[PDB]
């Protein structure tokens, strides 16, 4: 009698705990799962975008420099072509 | 790069947690689920046994009182046959 009543309170107890944990692994443990994805996707998106930025900055740099060198040659062309024409008064 | 490395720990830390929960869920929540059931079983088994003990002690008690009223009646017979026979001596 006395022995029972007591243990019962520990059952209706235990039973609510297991039900809160069943409330958590479906409300709490889901905000954390949605979030983990958001975070992981944002991070990977950024890592990949910095690899773009970088690779792009590099590409136009090459192009600039190629164009510069072509221009320094067109300078030489200009001067020498003018010396030719001039010499033929 | 600075602000990334930072949140990367954040994503690693949140990832460890989310892995515990899916393990405690599947090994500790499930251990408390066994125990709730056995506690519930034992509690119920004891209630039915108490009722069954009550039902039987009661049965015994009329099977006993009915048969004590009989022994008294048979006693009266014993005495009435005694006097009848005695008076035809």
Swiss-Prot record, chains A, B:
Post-translational modifications reported in the UniProt record:
Glycosylation is required for cell surface expression. Phosphorylated predominantly on Ser residues.
Where does the record say this protein resides?
Answer: Cell membrane; Endoplasmic reticulum membrane; Cytoplasm, Cytoskeleton; Sarcoplasmic reticulum
Task: List the expressing tissues.
Answer: Ubiquitously expressed in various human primary cells and tumor cell lines.
Phosphoserine occurs at: 10
Domain of life according to the entry:
Eukaryota
Question: What's the reported outcome of changing residue 57 to W?
Answer: In STRMK; autosomal dominant; promotes constitutive activation of the Ca(2+) release-activated Ca(2+) (CRAC) channel
What does the record say about domains? The microtubule tip localization signal (MtLS) motif; mediates interaction with MAPRE1 and targeting to the growing microtubule plus ends. The EF-hand domain is responsible for Ca(2+) sensitivity. It consists of a canonical helix-loop-helix EF motif (alpha1beta1alpha2; EF-hand 1) paired to a second helix-loop-helix EF motif (alpha3beta2alpha4; EF-hand 2). EF-hand 1 binds Ca(2+) whereas EF-hand 2 mediates the interactions with SAM domain.
Other remarks in the entry: Transfection of STIM1 into cells derived from a rhabdoid tumor and from a rhabdomyosarcoma that do not express detectable levels of STIM1 can induce cell death, suggesting a possible role in the control of rhabdomyosarcomas and rhabdoid tumors.
What the protein does comes down to:
Acts as a Ca(2+) sensor that gates two major inward rectifying Ca(2+) channels at the plasma membrane: Ca(2+) release-activated Ca(2+) (CRAC) channels and arachidonate-regulated Ca(2+)-selective (ARC) channels. Plays a role in mediating store-operated Ca(2+) entry (SOCE), a Ca(2+) influx following depletion of intracellular Ca(2+) stores. Upon Ca(2+) depletion, translocates from the endoplasmic reticulum to the plasma membrane where it activates CRAC channel pore-forming subunits ORA1, ORA2 and ORAI3 to generate sustained and oscillatory Ca(2+) entry. Involved in enamel formation.
Indicate the quaternary assembly: Monomer in the presence of Ca(2+); it oligomerizes in absence of Ca(2+). Forms homooligomers and heterooligomers with STIM2. Interacts with pore-forming subunits of CRAC channels, ORAI1, ORAI2 and ORAI3; this interaction is potentiated upon Ca(2+) store depletion. Interacts (via the transmembrane region and the SOAR/CAD domain) with SPPL3; the interaction promotes the binding of STIM1 to ORAI1. Interacts (via the SOAR/CAD domain) with ORAI1. Interacts with MAPRE1; probably required for targeting to the growing microtubule plus ends.
Query: Which disorder is it connected to?
Result: Immunodeficiency 10: An immune disorder characterized by recurrent infections, impaired activation and proliferative response of T-cells, decreased T-cell production of cytokines, lymphadenopathy, and normal lymphocytes counts and serum immunoglobulin levels. Additional features include thrombocytopenia, autoimmune hemolytic anemia, myopathy, partial iris hypoplasia, hepatosplenomegaly and defective enamel dentition.
* Name of the protein in question: Stromal interaction molecule 1
Q: Which gene encodes it?
A: STIM1
